[PDB]
Amino acid sequence: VLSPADKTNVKAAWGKVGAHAGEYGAEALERMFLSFPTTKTYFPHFDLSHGSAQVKGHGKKVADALTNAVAHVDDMPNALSALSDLHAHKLRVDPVNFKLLSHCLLVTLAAHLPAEFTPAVHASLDKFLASVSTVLTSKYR
C-alpha cells in the first residue's frame, strides 16, 4: 500500500534519475551479480563481465519496466502482468531473488542521488520495489 507521499517521493526520484535510468538498471544488475553470485545462474547465456552489451541492454529493459510501474502505480498488477507471467512460469525465478535485485536498485539510486535519497524517500522507494516484487511473484502455479 503506497501512500500519496510515497508516490510523490518515487516520482521525484524517477525525475532526478532522468535519462540515466537504463544505465542505472545495468549497474543494479552488475551489483547483484557480484554481491549475490547465485543470481548469475538465471543468465547462463549472458556475458556478465563489466561493460557487457547484454547487461547494458537488459538494464534498459529493467528500467523501462520499473518506469511503466511508476506511470501506472495505482494498477501495477495489470501493468506488470505479462512480466510476472514470464518471471514465474518461464524463468522460474526464486522469489528471494527479487529482494536482492530490489536492494541493489536502492544502492544504485543511493550512490547516484545524494540530495534525494533521504530516509523518507528511501522508505518510499523500498515500498515501491517491494510492491513491484509482490506483483512479480504473484503468478506461481
Partner 1 sequence: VHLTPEEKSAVTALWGKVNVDEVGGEALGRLLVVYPWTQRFFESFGDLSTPDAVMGNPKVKAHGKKMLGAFSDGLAHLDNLKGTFATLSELHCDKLHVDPENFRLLGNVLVCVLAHHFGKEFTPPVQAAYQKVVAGVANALAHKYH
Q: Which residues are annotated as a binding site for heme b?
A: 87
Site for partner 1 in 29-88 (CB under 8 A): 30-31, 34-38, 40-41, 88
10-18, 70-78, 81-89, 118-126 -> range binding ligand HEM (CB under 6 A): 81-89
Residue selected from 86, 126, 133, 134 as contacting partner 1 according to rule CB under 8 A: 126
Handedness of CA 47, 52, 57, 63 (dihedral sign): positive
List, as own/partner pairs, every contact residues 72-79 make where C-beta atoms lie below 8 angstroms and the sequence separation is at least 24, other chains included. 73/2, 73/7, 73/10, 73/128, 76/131, 76/132, 76/135, 77/135, 77/138
Q: Of 81 and 133, which CB lies nearer to ligand HEM in the complex structure?
A: 133
Binding site, annotated residues: 58, 87
92 is an interface residue for a second copy by CB under 8 A: no
Residue 61's binding partner among a second copy, ligand HEM, partner 1, none (Cβ under 5 to 8 angstroms by kind) is: ligand HEM
CA 117/CA 13 separation, integer angstroms: 8
